[PDB]
Design a protein around this ligand. Structure first.
Ligand SMILES: Nc1nc2c(ncn2[C@@H]2O[C@H](COP(=O)(O)OP(=O)(O)O)[C@@H](O)[C@H]2O)c(=O)[nH]1
Ligand SMILES: Nc1nc2c(ncn2[C@@H]2O[C@H](COP(=O)(O)OP(=O)(O)O)[C@@H](O)[C@H]2O)c(=O)[nH]1
Ligand SMILES: [Mg+2]
Ligand SMILES: [Mg+2]
Lengths: 174, 172
């Protein structure tokens, strides 16, 4: 019922982190794919169709705006190895998340710990504490983590625990 | 523009789309369930519906404005199970109207190849009598009967209809 949204910029490690974190029906519930189409009549290059394939009633129902905006926990992912600019790049994401719901909980995750310098990590921690944590106008940043997203580790296990706890505690206001 | 494919499970939605379809290295939006066995504050079964977004543009496309305004609907049903399945489209139509009040709908009966002419006749009669041009239902701008598992002239005409109505929706 609760949704875990994984957001961030491309190549930051979202899909890799989820695969590692995750380490019922016969079909997928919602399949989203792009369908490019060429037009017989020129002078009008068609866009592509963004196709949403729903398995049934329950899956369509789960995409009602109320669930999409008010029953979602966010993982905001960034690449530590590109430095403090990547924390800067999380600000437009937080503003966007806040606009969906004022009460959206967010867990910040920096990936690529294994190829990040100590200077980049300290710079990112300082930026998060100084500019992102408990700011009115941002979502509630419940926690923040630094992981190598490609392997198991104590740091990844604690992130799993944080996701479980925030989901269980979602029925609460901070 | 979004194409929303709705219907009940087993009606042929995925098969139909694969046949209809005959730019990024990764999927734009990946949705999957993650069941977690828990022992944190109790012990039940926690299933999270995970939405993995590629980037800003994919997240932007799920704004409630776009999920509900810029969408064209395929309402799919298994013609081989009889006019009961046309009846089952009514709750879908009411849901589409509530969700996307100006969105057009194309009705697609699949399993033509294993349907009899009695079921197809009963189905079109119920469509024309009970579904088309009703206030409270979306606009049904076309209806089709196909074998969704292979190419055919009927499937090609459905494909052209989907393309033309997507282009005309953006215009109107
Ligand atoms: N060394 C290292 N590579 C990572 C890490 N996380 C992701 N990657 C790599 O970054 C690249 C992009 O990963 P991907 O999950 O596709 O990013 P997405 O576009 O955000 O979903 C892949 O080569 C991944 O193996 C990490 O923690 N450490
Ligand atoms: N004989 C026949 N089988 C179909 C047709 N359309 C779908 N199927 C079959 O119905 C079953 C369910 O298909 P699927 O696409 O998974 O349905 P979905 O749950 O609505 O996505 C598959 O075995 C398909 O091969 C059709 O037009 N004719
Ligand atoms: Mg990805
Ligand atoms: Mg399917």
């Amino acid at each position: 019922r609760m949704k875990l949204m994984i957001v961030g910029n491309t190549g930051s490690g979202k899909t890799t982190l989820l695969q590692q974190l995750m380490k019922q029906s016969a079909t997928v519930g919602i399949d989203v794919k792009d369908w490019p189409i060429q037009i017989r009549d020129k002078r009008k290059r068609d866009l592509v169709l963004n196709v949403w394939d729903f398995a049934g009633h329950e899956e369509f129902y789960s995409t009602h705006p109320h669930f999409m905006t008010q029953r979602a926990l966010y993982l905001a992912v960034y690449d530590l190895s590109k430095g403090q600019a990547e924390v800067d790049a999380m600000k437009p994401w937080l503003f966007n998340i806040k606009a969906r719901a004022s009460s959206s909980p967010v867990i910040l995750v920096g990936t690529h710990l294994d190829v990040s310098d100590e200077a980049q990590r300290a710079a990112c921690m300082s930026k998060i504490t100084k500019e992102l944590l408990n700011k009115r106008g941002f979502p509630a940043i419940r926690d923040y983590h630094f992981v190598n997203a490609t392997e198991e580790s104590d740091a990844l296990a604690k992130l799993r625990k944080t996701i479980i706890n925030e989901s269980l505690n979602f029925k609460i206001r901070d």
